[PDB]
Amino acid sequence: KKVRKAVIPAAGLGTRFLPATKAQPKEMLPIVDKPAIQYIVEEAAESGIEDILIITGRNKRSIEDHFDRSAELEFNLREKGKTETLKEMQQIADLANIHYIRQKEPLGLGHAVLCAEHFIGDEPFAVLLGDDIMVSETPALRQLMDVYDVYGTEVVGVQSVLPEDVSKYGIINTSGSQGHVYEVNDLVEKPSPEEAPSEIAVMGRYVLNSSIFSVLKTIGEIQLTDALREVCRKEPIHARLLEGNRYDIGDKLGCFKASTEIGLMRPEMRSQLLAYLEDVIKRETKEMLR
Amino acid sequence: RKKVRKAVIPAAGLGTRFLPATKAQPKEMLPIVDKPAIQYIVEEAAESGIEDILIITGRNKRSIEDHFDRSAELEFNLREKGKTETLKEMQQIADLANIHYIRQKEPLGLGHAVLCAEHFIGDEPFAVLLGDDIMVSETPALRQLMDVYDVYGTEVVGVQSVLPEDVSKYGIINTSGSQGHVYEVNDLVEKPSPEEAPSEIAVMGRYVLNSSIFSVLKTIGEIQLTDALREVCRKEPIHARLLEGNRYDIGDKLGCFKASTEIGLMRPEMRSQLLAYLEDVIKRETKEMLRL
């Protein structure tokens, strides 16, 4: 069974970005000129996912609207000649088939994954937390999916991190390592620097099975790791080192960084940007020498 | 001899220059540093001593109206998390001014937009602020315009100079001369070719107008605000104020990025990490370029 369905939980009230997000959702904050959520749906589509369930909350209509056809916008783009544009707008609505479900009250990412139960039903599915953007010749998810196609168990997405960071993330407890594909025997959430049995963390990407669904039912906020953990006791899961560049967007500054770097891949903005940063640094030195 | 206390902020664009960000959400809500662009404009107004703002809004721009109101679910979550600093901050936003909205029913640009405001202001002087730039100033930009009005009581336009190339990006003043910080506008073109332009002094989407401007705007009528200063010019000449502080255009993607960086570097909590990051990027770009 090929992975063809994915789950983006998106019910955060996103308080870290106040006041940008007082009256609009975190998932829509622009990254270069793209809403964060678009990057994630783009990953999925490019990995060959055909159906996404977005677990949404109150006042996130704008997400649903983003991925539909905006009539008034289509008209106005025509009457102005922006055909290349009108076309890029239509493609957004074509990426995937976007389903939505409301998470009732905020009970966390475990609840959220359970809400997907009947939608994915009896297929393996991808989960994508919307917390980092991945630049890669092979889409992050597609990577996790290729490990799945092989092992057929719960695969996790991973990247090494510097110790004294391990408390912010999670952790592969590896006792083996083969290919670009570590092998997982256990798991810990937010391990104190010493408690941490590795330097490798999971990068908000997953492929799971319906199995996991029942497992998470049983265990039952409901942390999703404990389930990926109680699967590991019965059997060993798998993790892929994610080839590509990772931009954490949990922070205000995280978003700043992400915008600049992705900015730098745009040809038209690369030199304009880079020039501009040179001249900001000059101005800052000159000022500080007075 | 009346005080300016009402401003009109026209806000009914589809924000094409910003697609796909603005596909399903308004241009004025795009964040500059961590605050919506629209909030900057209200803030300038508030601190300029404006008490009553009319936003001329369009369809699917509810988020502006929500932004400046109590947000009960947010409030709750903030209390139940302790962020009393933030809860107070949010509460402040909702207090900056008296925000009124009207829908401009059909998009006929500014001018019509301004006419929309007619009954709301009735018979006073008012400010218009198009939001195309953020000004960092000791004295709030609009206040500066207002102080020249207090003295000359004509329509007063806010200005700064620009390099000749970009004089078709603007409306250009046409002085006889100047006196302290107040130029003496004799006429006004729309957006002139670099030689057709009779100055390199451009209007910075600030205006303090008089109620009279309505009569005017009606006679001319696609109603351009500029032409209705042109006619006010025929009978009698208008004033301009050179605007004290630092301007950051945000009409462009790049503009906004520059704005975010500039304003960001002014925030103490941010400054050191941001500067750090910036130096880093250049350092990293150098290494990788020299090895190629």
Numbering used by the authors:
A (entry chain B): 3 to 222, 228 to 297
B (entry chain A): 2 to 222, 228 to 298
Task: Give passages from the manuscript.
To determine the crystal structure of YngB, selenomethionine-substituted protein was produced in Escherichia coli and purified as a C-terminal His-tag fusion protein. The protein crystallized as a dimer in the asymmetric unit and the structure was solved at 2.80 Å by experimental phasing. YngB displayed a Rossmann fold with alternating α-helices and β-strands, which is commonly found in nucleotide-binding proteins. More specifically, the YngB monomer contains a central β-sheet surrounded by α-helices. Similar to the dimer interactions described for homologous UGPases, hydrogen bonds are formed between Tyr102 residues on the two β-strands located at the interface of the monomers, producing an extended central β-sheet spanning across the two subunits. The overall structure of YngB is very similar to homologous UGPases including A4JT02, GalUHp, and GalUCg as shown by superimposition. The outermost C-terminal α-helix is one of the most variable regions and absent either in GalUHp or in a different conformation in GalUCg. The structures superimposed with an RMSD of 1.61 Å and the putative UDP-glucose binding pocket could easily be identified in YngB. Based on this alignment, it can be predicted that residues Gly110, Gln105, Ala13, Gly14, Glu29, and Lys28 in YngB interact with the uridine moiety; Asp 133 is involved in the chelation of an Mg2+ ion; Asp 134, Val 204, Gly 172, and Glu 191 interact with the glucose moiety; and Lys 192 interacts with the diphosphate moiety. From these data, apparent Km values of 45.6 ± 3.24 μM (GtaB) and 42.1 ± 20.2 μM (YngB) were calculated for Glc-1-P and 49.5 ± 10.2 μM (GtaB) and 62.9 ± 13.8 μM (YngB) for UTP, respectively. kcat values of 1.06 s-1 (GtaB) and 0.264 s-1 (YngB) were calculated for Glc-1-P and 1.04 s-1 (GtaB) and 0.293 s-1 (YngB) for UTP, respectively.
The nucleotide-activated sugar precursor UDP-glucose is produced from UTP and glucose-1-phosphate by UTP-glucose-1-phosphate uridylyltransferase (UGPase) enzymes. However, apart from GtaB, two other predicted UGPases, YtdA and YngB, are encoded in the B. subtilis 168 genome: as part of this study, we investigated the function of YngB. Here we show that, based on its crystal structure and in vitro and in vivo biochemical activity, the B. subtilis YngB protein is a functional UGPase. Furthermore, our data show that YngB is a functional UGPase that augments UDP-glucose production under oxygen-limiting conditions.
